[PDB]
Amino acid sequence: AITPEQIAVEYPIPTYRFVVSVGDEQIPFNNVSGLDVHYDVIEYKDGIG
Amino acid sequence: YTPSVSHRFIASFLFNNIPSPLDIAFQRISGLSRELQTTQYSQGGENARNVWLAEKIQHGSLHLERGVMTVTPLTLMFDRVLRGEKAVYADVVIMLLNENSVPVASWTLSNALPVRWSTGDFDANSNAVLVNSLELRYQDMRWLGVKV
């Protein structure tokens, strides 16, 4: 027995229901992608390893 | 005949016969070279052979690169010389280490004089470590070890 309030707390979320706001206005969209964050890596090596 | 790699090395600076324990890690050390300067002489009737006459021996310079870090005795000596104070000498021992941290080849330099300190550019678009470049001019070079 699993109650609906338990699902809303513990279960993961699907992707197909979303709302997008552009500026101060909301526009219905079909697909949104690319929200990624990337960093570079700086390395330094010396003679003693 | 097994060759040795060139990415494991150590350098030690001695100031007044006292080694500096914080100045052993460097990003790069330039190769050490010795040259016997010669002039070519030509005889009168000798048009098919060459003659080379020996002269004094020229030593190269010692260049090191290192990132910006906490002030060390090597830094203080370099700053004092380049601030206009009395010139001082230092002795350097470069060692090439094997897998057991045993120096297979070592070079010793007598009376090294700090002559140049430089730093990298401040670039707002870069992803790199700020690197100091040091150069010294020494009087004599001498190598010791089982390999060379």
Side-chain angles (χ1 to χ4, degrees), chain B residues 53-67:
Chain B
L53 305 171
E55 309 230 29
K56 306 161 138 115
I57 281 153
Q58 186 84 18
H59 292 282
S61 286
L62 175 76
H63 295 90
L64 311 118
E65 293 166 324
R66 188 172 75 165

Side-chain angles (χ1 to χ4, degrees), chain A residues 40-49, chain B residues 7-9 25-27 66-67 127 129:
Chain A
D40 298 88
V41 184
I42 299 156
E43 286 146 314
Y44 181 80
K45 289 181 180 179
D46 88 9
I48 49 164
Chain B
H7 69 264
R8 180 75 76 247
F9 55 94
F26 294 89
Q27 176 193 262
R66 188 172 75 165
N127 282 286
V129 153

Side-chain angles (χ1 to χ4, degrees), chain B residues 65-116:
Chain B
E65 293 166 324
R66 188 172 75 165
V68 167
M69 63 182 54
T70 300
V71 173
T72 51
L74 170 69
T75 277
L76 289 150
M77 141 172 289
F78 253 83
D79 203 41
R80 276 193 219 100
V81 176
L82 302 176
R83 265 202 284 104
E85 285 186 30
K86 281 261 304 168
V88 281
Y89 285 154
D91 295 33
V92 202
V93 181
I94 321 283
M95 293 175 248
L96 182 84
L97 310 177
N98 64 356
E99 73 266 17
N100 309 307
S101 295
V102 166
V104 285
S106 90
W107 299 262
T108 206
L109 327 176
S110 324
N111 296 350
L113 175 68
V115 290
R116 221 183 98 84

Side-chain angles (χ1 to χ4, degrees), chain A residues 3 5-6 8 11 17 20 23 27-28 32 34-35 39 41 45 48:
Chain A
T3 303
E5 295 62 26
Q6 279 156 54
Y11 274 44
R17 189 65 71 239
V20 182
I27 303 170
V32 177
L35 296 95
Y39 281 79
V41 184
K45 289 181 180 179
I48 49 164

Side-chain angles (χ1 to χ4, degrees), chain A residues 14-22 25-30 32 35:
Chain A
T15 41
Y16 54 94
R17 189 65 71 239
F18 60 96
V19 54
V20 182
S21 188
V22 175
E25 195 192 337
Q26 278 172 328
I27 303 170
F29 276 99
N30 170 249
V32 177
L35 296 95

